Design a protein around this ligand. Structure first.
Ligand SMILES: *[C@@H]1O[C@H](CO)[C@@H](O[C@@H]2O[C@H](CO)[C@@H](O)[C@H](O)[C@H]2NC(C)=O)[C@H](O)[C@H]1NC(C)=O
Lengths: 53, 52
């Protein structure tokens, strides 16, 4: 209109959510509980010698 | 000095050695097993805390 140009109003997103990126250390000692559980049950068997004889 | 007598006497000695040897073997084996069990128990107890 005349010399000036008119532009439409811009709609705005109401909310934003922040989810930052985190470094991944990738440690291996955690989630190894099964090995500890296996260590718990060694179960060495010893039979008395001389009771039979 | 009967020929059977000094043989019976050696037969007496030739069995207490076996009995005592068996007893000492059992004692040693049981002690070793108890030591191993104590070591593994302490190792597990120390191992849990560092993981946590
Ligand atoms: C939290 O744990 C999850 C599951 O272990 C990890 O997600 C894995 O990440 C690796 C590396 O990018 C991928 O190869 C796997 O496919 C992912 N698995 C799943 C189920 O998503 C995640 O990386 C861990 N978070 C941190 C910060 O270490």
């Amino acid at each position: 209109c005349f010399g000036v140009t008119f532009k439409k109003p811009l709609v705005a997103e109401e909310k934003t959510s922040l989810e930052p990126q985190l470094p991944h250390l990738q440690l291996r000692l955690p989630h190894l509980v099964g090995i500890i559980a296996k260590i718990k049950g060694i179960k060495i068997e010893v039979t008395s010698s001389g009771e039979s004889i | 000095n009967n020929n059977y007598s000094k043989l019976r006497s050696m037969g007496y000695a030739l069995t207490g050695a076996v009995q005592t040897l068996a007893q000492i073997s059992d004692i040693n084996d049981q002690n070793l097993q108890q030591g191993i069990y104590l070591l593994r128990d302490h190792i597990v107890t120390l191992m849990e805390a560092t993981l946590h």
